[PDB]
Structure 1
Amino acid sequence: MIPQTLTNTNLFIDGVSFAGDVPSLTLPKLAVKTEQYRAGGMDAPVSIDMGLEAMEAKFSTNGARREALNFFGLADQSAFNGVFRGSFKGQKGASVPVVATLRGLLKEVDPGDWKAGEKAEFKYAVAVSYYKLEVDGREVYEIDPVNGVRAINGVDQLAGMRNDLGL
């Protein structure tokens, strides 16, 4: 394998490019709600998957990006749409894109302390519902909470337990 790191980053919100003011992103920490399980006839619990938990995708800007402040606390939850683009250049030249389509509620606008000589850093957070990460255009994650879509690498990992609940 080649040494491959993050170099540059981009953020879109409803098509609007944030090509000038995003110092930081944060993809949502995908974690399984692990319930450790030790029962009769074993030890050292075995951690059955119960499902995921909530997916906050923080980021921050340091200008008056009013086009990002308009999406706080609307009546339509999951109306904040946006992608977290980012390219990994590697060592052998051509860069591998990673994009991450989001759809959630902008549940936090955290304006920083204004120390009058430092940056601003309007830190945000979106508790996303829909989540789709791509690598070089190839699919890895479809995470849709409602209507039961967990599709890891295109194959649906909840389809066997969706045609029994009758969804």
Structure 2
Amino acid sequence: IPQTLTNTNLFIDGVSFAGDVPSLTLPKLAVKTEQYRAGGMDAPVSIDMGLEAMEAKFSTNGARREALNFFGLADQSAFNGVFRGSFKGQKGASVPVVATLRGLLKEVDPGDWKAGEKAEFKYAVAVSYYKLEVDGREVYEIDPVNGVRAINGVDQLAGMRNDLGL
């Protein structure tokens, strides 16, 4: 049932960037693993050790102001932004995929201005909070400063929250 992504749009603070954003990138949600090899067994196995540093990145190719004006902002996690993306599907009805991500803008990379090529600024928000929804349904909600890694409702850290006494 071919889905595929058709169109994409990017918010920062309500301000739509319906225009300059030829690339989005959601934070690669990865676990830490640590290949556990140990007594009684050959071949490792790997363990949930917590997630990796979620970093997301978009790249407007316009001097956009509304994006540049969050860089290094004293209040880390002030930059909010929402990465919406419509997946078409061969049978018409498009699936809204939307990923709000309160984080810290971190860095800004304007590449080679060449007087004949889309300048293309770049950005890389060090994501703090991150909720990825599909068809208006929470699939992920990863909150580090709180410990709320919750796959569609069920909170997989509800058991470690207690043992830590949070």
The TM tier, using the shorter chain, reads over 0.9
Q: How far apart, CA to CA, are the structure 2 residues paired with 1:148 and 1:109? A: 29
Q: How far apart, CA to CA, are the structure 2 residues paired with 1:94 and 1:48? A: 39
1:100-139: CA deviations, max 9, x gaps?
Answer: 0001111110001001100011011000000000000011
SS in 1 for 2:66: helix
Q: How far apart, CA to CA, are the structure 1 residues paired with 2:159 and 2:33? A: 20
SS in 1 for 2:67: helix
1:47-99: CA deviations, max 9, x gaps?
Answer: 01100011110110111100100000011000000100001010001100000
1:33-54: CA deviations, max 9, x gaps?
Answer: 1100111100110001100011
Q: How far apart, CA to CA, are the structure 2 residues paired with 1:43 and 1:16? A: 55
Offset at 1:147?
1.2
What is the TM-score normalised by the length of structure 2?
0.99
Runs of 4 or more consecutive aligned structure 1 residues displaced over 4 Å after TM superposition: none
Q: How far apart, CA to CA, are the structure 1 residues paired with 2:50 and 2:97? A: 24
Q: How far apart, CA to CA, are the structure 2 residues paired with 1:133 and 1:89? A: 18
Q: Percent identity?
A: 100
What is the TM-score normalised by the length of structure 1?
0.98
Partner of residue 52, structure 1: 51
Offset at 1:24?
0.3
Q: How far apart, CA to CA, are the structure 2 residues paired with 1:159 and 1:99? A: 25
Structure with the largest fraction of strand: 1
Unaligned runs of 5+ in 1: none
Q: How far apart, CA to CA, are the structure 2 residues paired with 1:60 and 1:155? A: 33
- Count residues in correspondence: 166
Q: How far apart, CA to CA, are the structure 1 residues paired with 2:99 and 2:12? A: 12
What is the 5 A alignment of 1:1-167? 2-167=1-166
